[model samples]
Target: SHVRKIIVASDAGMGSSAMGAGVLRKKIQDAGLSQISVTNSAINNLPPDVDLVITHRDLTERAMRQVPQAQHISLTNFLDSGLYTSLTERLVAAQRH
Candidate 1:
């Protein structure tokens, strides 16, 4: 399918987070997608019109408490989204920053 837009959410500037956006942004660019955009914040900045949400970090207990209901995917085990690689990769890559 033609990827109309790519929205990447992350707190890569914060503690122990991966260089997710950097990698994601590079991938999007390399794919030749012009409509892609990457934001350096978490779900807090999620767009109301977002088609999909991909979370790449583990949320803290407090952070979890503030989570809103949405069509979201967490690459983290803590939220029980049932996606393995998403969450597991964070456990390893998260400590890079």
Candidate 2:
């Protein structure tokens, strides 16, 4: 019921996580999802409006605690460790419209 704004965050928000926003948004486009917006932030700077977070498993705990309102996806893979591939499908499947 809450999957719209997506953010790619990590311990650091600069290169460590910001780079994923472009790539993730591209993949989102490939899935035909247009309204979804991908944002990037540090674990501590996550926007309160964010509903989903894509971050490393190592920092998942911090992320969850920092923003209890957002759903956490602890992805051990680096963008495409075979796990990210599944997220695309999962997101598409969960589409409301």
Candidate 3:
């Protein structure tokens, strides 16, 4: 690690897309991350003013446009190389390779 600090945030609440963000949030915290939140209010309210927004899926064009001008990232994009597959049907796991 370097001499810098970082913040991590995710949406791991009562929803479909965010079902797995909790796991990712835990991993980041274990790695010594300084901050994290599971607040899924990017649209109706302000996201906690953190360094990043780590959601399970791409930001809805709405949330993308509204949330603070900070970096917005999808959890999938940050997954380990072996687990980044996109589901085929909305109901099934799909391949990205």
Candidate 4:
């Protein structure tokens, strides 16, 4: 399935969430991934039916339990440029079907 709704999750402080989401968002924009939407969310309040969700390692366990149907990425640091670049490349590369 193709990703349409992607989220960056946190416990509550969305400032951190938004920061990471924004980084990925801009990269997706540069990649022209118009079909994909990236946003920030609270781990406890994650919406159902999301396509993908990334969370800080501290909260990843709870996030996965909350949305088991969504593919999950756990990261130790939100500021990892490789997460943004490699992931963006992976997504674009993923759609090469």
Q: Return the top candidate by TM-score.
A: 4
Better of 2 and 3 by lDDT: 2
**Candidate 4 structure quality by residue, lDDT tens digits, 1-97:** 5667879888894668989888888888787778888888788778888888888888888888987877888776767887667777877887675
lDDT of 3 at 41: 37
lDDT of 1 by residue, 1-97 (tens): 3223334455543432234445555655655554655444554565555443555555433233344433344555323434433433442343232
Q: Which candidate, 3 or 4, has the higher TM-score?
A: 4
Per-residue lDDT of model 2, residues 16-92, tens digit only: 58666777788898877888888888888887778888888888888888887678888776656477767777888
Name model 3 segments beyond 4 Å from true.
Answer: 1-13, 34-39, 56-58, 75-97
Predicted candidate 4, C-alpha RMSD: 1.4
What residue pairs are clashing in model 1? 75-86, 75-87, 76-87
- TM-score each candidate: 0.46, 0.86, 0.45, 0.89
Q: Whole-model Cα lDDT per candidate? A: 0.45, 0.79, 0.40, 0.80
User: Which candidate leads in lDDT?
Assistant: 4
Taking the tens digit of each residue's C-alpha lDDT, what string does model 3 give over 1-97? 1211123333433463343454544444554544333334323454435444444455444445655565554545554434423311211211111
Q: Order of candidates by TM-score, top first?
A: 4, 2, 1, 3
What's the TM for model 4? 0.89
Candidate 4 residue runs with Cα over 4 Å from true position: none
Candidate number that wins on TM-score, 1 or 2: 2
